[PDB]
Amino acid sequence: GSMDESGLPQLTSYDCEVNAPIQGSRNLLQGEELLRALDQVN
Amino acid sequence: MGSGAHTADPEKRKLIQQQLVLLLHAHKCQRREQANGEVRQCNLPHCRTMKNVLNHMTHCQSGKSCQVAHCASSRQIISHWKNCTRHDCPVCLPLKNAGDK
Ligand SMILES: [Zn+2]
Numbered sequence: 001g002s003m004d005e006s007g008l009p010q011l012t013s014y015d016c017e018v019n020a021p022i023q024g025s026r027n028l029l030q031g032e033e034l035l036r037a038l039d040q041v042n
Numbered sequence: 043m044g045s046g047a048h049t050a051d052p053e054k055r056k057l058i059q060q061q062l063v064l065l066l067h068a069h070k071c072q073r074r075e076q077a078n079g080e081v082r083q084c085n086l087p088h089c090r091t092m093k094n095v096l097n098h099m100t101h102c103q104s105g106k107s108c109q110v111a112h113c114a115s116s117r118q119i120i121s122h123w124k125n126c127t128r129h130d131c132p133v134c135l136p137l138k139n140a141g142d143k
């Protein structure tokens with residue numbers, strides 16, 4: 001059975017969506033855009 | 043459809059902030075070494091780990107259906123933040139209370 005191990009407190013796609021959703025329609029930043037985007041303070 | 047219960051625990055919002063802060067950290071943390079040339083791995087399991095998870099996501103075009111929890115999950119975290127606009131952001135609010143000037 002897929003029993004992947006991990007130490008860092010991980011969250012489920014729901015635990016995130018519920019606590020903070022994107023409002024449908026996947027976000028723009030994902031891979032490299034996430035770094036280019038994350039660096040858009042104000 | 044899922045269970046159809048619509049759960050919601052604020053006690054976790056704290057964990058969502060740290061992950062959003064560590065990601066924010068790790069984001070600049072990796073940019074802090076470049077300024078100080080070759081630097082040692084800062085004493086922060088969170089950052090270092092995110093640096094690893096970050097490298098993953100950069101090649102995780104799948105997202106959500108990937109093979110890593112911190113990948114897909116982290117993708118939704120940062121994604122929400124930026125995509126978040128004109129709403130009741132419970133995470134972005136406490137992290138950067140900015141909306142009612
Ligand atoms: Zn760090």
Ligand SMILES: [Zn+2]
Nearest residue numbers: 102108110113
């Ligand atoms: Zn992945």
Ligand SMILES: [Zn+2]
Nearest residue numbers: 123126131134
């Ligand atoms: Zn938000």
